[PDB]
Design a protein around this ligand. Structure first.
Ligand SMILES: COc1ccc(Cl)cc1S(=O)(=O)Nc1cccn2nc(C)nc12
Ligand SMILES: N[C@@H](Cc1ccc(O)cc1)C(=O)O
Length: 293
């Protein structure tokens, strides 16, 4: 039964989260775990820190550059008693386009856990192995394990150190419409980035337009490559501004009635405090969302 969606995100082990379109509330999300294949677990924390396995980040990044935002179709081969769905995703509008699992195994960024589907995966794995790609390269793959830091040591120094020069980063999670979790590169600091000069509504049951603000920002920036101006800090959080070619998310959120200009932190906004007050004034005059009567 061929189903359809957009890629919301790609996870640890290249299980992919697929979403639909919303119809009164945020979109329905499904987490598909790729059938017949195995990729590494990414780094994670619990009792202790545990690092990236070999080749897990490069696998995640491969499907991320390739898939995020695109329209896929999928098919659910099984549903386990643990509450998980296994299946195959095809990057296109049909079950004969580009099987994403075949891309992984040909790059050597995954492996197999007879029939046409299983034959195609073999043909990919033999090629990858016979061209020394990914995990079939000479070595242990230690150069693919990120030196992942969960906290910045001296934050004021760290921000002062970059002199407001944008830092390439990946936006890994959206807590609410105005605070994100940003993977900074090339040092692999995973940290909390609050948008300088604004505040969206927030999750506790949630304030009006929190879920809407979260979605607005999340569908535009989750698992996208961005640059961040690190402007100041609040505790172990980075006050900053996000750059992307399509626009300024801070300037939009206010302009679209999803945010209010907060007085303290707007002093550190480098891109120009007049524009944030202007876009709020745009929303307020138009009676948009948080400004309705
Ligand atoms: C992946 O895309 C994005 C990344 C970052 C930002 Cl800040 C915006 C976008 S966007 O092009 O998707 N949206 C929009 C762009 C411009 C104006 N509007 N107005 C509405 C209502 N949306 C947009
Ligand atoms: N606009 C309001 C709903 C409302 C509008 C007009 C009224 O007179 C009363 C309530 C919300 O927010």
């Amino acid at each position: 039964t061929v189903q359809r969606g957009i890629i919301k995100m790609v996870l640890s082990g290249c299980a992919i989260i697929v979403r639909g379109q919303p119809r009164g509330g945020p979109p329905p999300e499904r987490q598909i775990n790729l059938s017949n294949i195995r990729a590494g677990n990414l780094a994670r924390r619990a009792a202790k820190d545990t690092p990236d396995e070999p080749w897990a980040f490069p696998a995640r990044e491969f499907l991320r550059k390739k898939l995020i935002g695109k329209e896929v179709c999928f098919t659910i081969e099984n549903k386990t008693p643990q509450g998980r769905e296994y299946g195959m995703i095809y990057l296109g509008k049909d079950t004969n386009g580009e099987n994403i699992a075949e891309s992984l195994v040909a790059e050597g960024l995954a492996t197999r856990r007879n029939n046409p589907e299983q034959n195609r995966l073999s043909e990919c794995e033999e090629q990858a192995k016979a061209a020394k790609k990914g995990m079939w390269s000479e070595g242990n793959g230690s150069h693919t394990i990120r030196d992942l830091k969960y906290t910045i040591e001296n934050p004021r120094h760290f921000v002062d150190s970059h002199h407001q020069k944008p830092v390439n980063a990946i936006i890994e999670h959206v807590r609410d419409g105005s605070v994100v979790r940003a993977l900074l590169l090339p040092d692999y600091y995973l940290v909390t980035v609050m948008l300088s000069g604004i505040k969206c509504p927030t999750f506790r049951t949630p304030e009006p337009f929190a879920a809407e603000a979260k979605f607005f920002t999340e569908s535009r920036l989750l698992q996208r490559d961005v640059q961040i101006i690190l402007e100041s800090c609040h505790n172990q959080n980075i006050l900053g501004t996000i750059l992307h070619p399509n626009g300024n998310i801070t300037e939009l959120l206010l302009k679209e009635g999803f945010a209010r200009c907060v007085d303290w932190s707007i002093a550190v906004y480098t891109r120009g405090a007049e524009k944030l007050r202007a876009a709020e004034r745009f929303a307020k005059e138009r009676r948009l969302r948080i400004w309705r009567d």
